[PDB]
Amino acid sequence: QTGYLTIGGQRYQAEINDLENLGEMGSGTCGQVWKMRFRKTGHVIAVKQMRRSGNKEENKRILMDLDVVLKSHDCPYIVQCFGTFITNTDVFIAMELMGTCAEKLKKRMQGPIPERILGKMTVAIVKALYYLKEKHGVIHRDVKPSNILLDERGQIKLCDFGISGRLAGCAAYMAPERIDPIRADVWSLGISLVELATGQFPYKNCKTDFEVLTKVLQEEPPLLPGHMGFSGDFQSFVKDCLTKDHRKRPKYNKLLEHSFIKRYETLEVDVASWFKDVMAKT
Length: 282
Ligand SMILES: */C=C/C(=O)N1CCC[C@@H](n2nc(-c3cccc4ccccc34)c3c(N)ncnc32)C1
Hints:
This protein has ten helices and ten strands. The protein is α+β, with helices and mostly antiparallel strands. The protein folds into two domains: 1-98, no CATH class; 99-282, Transferase(Phosphotransferase), domain 1, CATH 1.10.510.10. It has a five-stranded antiparallel beta sheet, covered by helices on one side. A three-stranded antiparallel beta sheet has the order 8-9-10. Bound molecules: ligand 1. Residues 25-26, 29, 33, 46, 48, 65, 93, 95-98, 101, 103-104, 146, 159-160 line the site of ligand 1.
């Protein structure tokens, strides 16, 4: 159904006129994402506007992402949908208003991201990918820092399922078996962890996409450096995530039992204040 907004257990009958446009969020999108304030409850939400006049391929990925998000209402590690509005010319998709992605966080930091923040990020992303494979049999196929969203309250969720499968992403984070033919998102997560932990994308100085694919297959997996104080569990988790042979790469339920994940499930990391600190320096 449409015309409703479920923000915090309570449902609210609403139309597009009940939301005040506070401006466009982000310059480059897969569809116009607006910051909007719900006049009836003061809630500020993120509303993606899909025009029926828009691009055919872009609208297909928007609906595919919306399909997965509507199915993931019980996963706390996936950005939640609040409702939809279908007009004669547009489709508005209201979603959880996050802060920013991990890519923009890396640009604002102008350096590495602490391990304690990446530890909480790993636990959230791995469980989100595990929820898609078991509860819905869905593969993400585009795990990257730009698809990891954080907010003022320390939440870390996964966001874009535009090219998700039911069982091609960015070439920079593609697994070897996806270039030269299940657990391909595990490799993408490992590549994203190295980029955020070092501040430098591991495959450096690649002018074309095919050259990146060449380095993925020809070069050794880019492991975590050993002169940055990374814990033994962090370097161990990245090594298993970046196993070249996918048959030896651990499935999720073995990853969820890794000492790196088990540590940051119980550990109390103040991601909310670290996020608020970095955001104060643009
Ligand atoms: C690195 C991510 C980033 O820079 N951008 C541009 C700014 C806005 C970011 N973003 N996207 C959404 C969003 C909301 C609803 C549905 C979907 C579906 C697929 C991809 C993104 C989204 C954002 C929300 N809700 N909140 C903050 N930022 C959002 C993407």
